[PDB]
Amino acid sequence: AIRKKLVIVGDGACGKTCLLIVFSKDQFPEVYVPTVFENYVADIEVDGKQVELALWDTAGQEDYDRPRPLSYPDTDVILMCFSIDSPDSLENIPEKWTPEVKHFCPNVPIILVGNKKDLRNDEHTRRELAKMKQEPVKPEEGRDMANRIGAFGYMECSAKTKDGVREVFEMATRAALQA
Numbered sequence: 001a002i003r004k005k006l007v008i009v010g011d012g013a014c015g016k017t018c019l020l021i022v023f024s025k026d027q028f029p030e031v032y033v034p035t036v037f038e039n040y041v042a043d044i045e046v047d048g049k050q051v052e053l054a055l056w057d058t059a060g061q062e063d064y065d066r067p068r069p070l071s072y073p074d075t076d077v078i079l080m081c082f083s084i085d086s087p088d089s090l091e092n093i094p095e096k097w098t099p100e101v102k103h104f105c106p107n108v109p110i111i112l113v114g115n116k117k118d119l120r121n122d123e124h125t126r127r128e129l130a131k132m133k134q135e136p137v138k139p140e141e142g143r144d145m146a147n148r149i150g151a152f153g154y155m156e157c158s159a160k161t162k163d164g165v166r167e168v169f170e171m172a173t174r175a176a177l178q179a
């Protein structure tokens with residue numbers, strides 16, 4: 001297999017760990033783990049190519065003992081995530097994650113990923129955002145942000161329902177394979 005390294009970044013609680021675990025293990029987790037610490041290397045075939053994809057989960061600022069800069073060397077593709085239930089997590093894409101990723105991983109392809117797509121039509125989510133004069137992120141807003149940051153693509157998924165999960169990793173693998 002062709003070997004590639006994937007790093008996932010984005011705001012705390014936007015669904016990074018659950019996305020990796022659903023992709024890797026095909027089951028939504030029952031216990032809470034801030035960052036996947038088991039070594040996961042996933043086998044995936046795309047366009048008739050066998051690829052081994054190392055999945056590197058990342059910690060928040062508060063985890064000073066496991067700092068994120070150590071994750072960036074030799075990265076082949078980035079998943080840069082926000083949550084569709086959190087317009088705040090989208091605004092951090094240009095203001096925090098893109099400056100960080102492009103600093104440490106110049107010229108590495110980025111897939112922008114909108115997580116928790118199942119919450120777009122969730123009424124608890126709608127009600128809570130409405131009290132803040134907010135609403136769920138629209139797909140067009142994600143695509144616009146993908147243009148702004150020079151992402152290779154924009155994808156939406158739900159780790160909870162599995163919708164779009166495989167496709168995220170397939171797109172990321174295709175990006176990582178580009179010469």
Ligand SMILES: Nc1nc2c(ncn2[C@@H]2O[C@H](COP(=O)(O)OP(=O)(O)O)[C@@H](O)[C@H]2O)c(=O)[nH]1
Nearest residue numbers: 011012013014015016017018019116158159160
């Ligand atoms: N509704 C919904 N909740 C999700 C989804 N993915 C994760 N969550 C929840 O969001 C919270 C944060 O998820 P986690 O993967 O730990 O986020 P991380 O901090 O980015 O690693 C947890 O309560 C998860 O159960 C999803 O696709 N849909």
Ligand SMILES: [Mg+2]
Nearest residue numbers: 016017034035
């Ligand atoms: Mg996590």
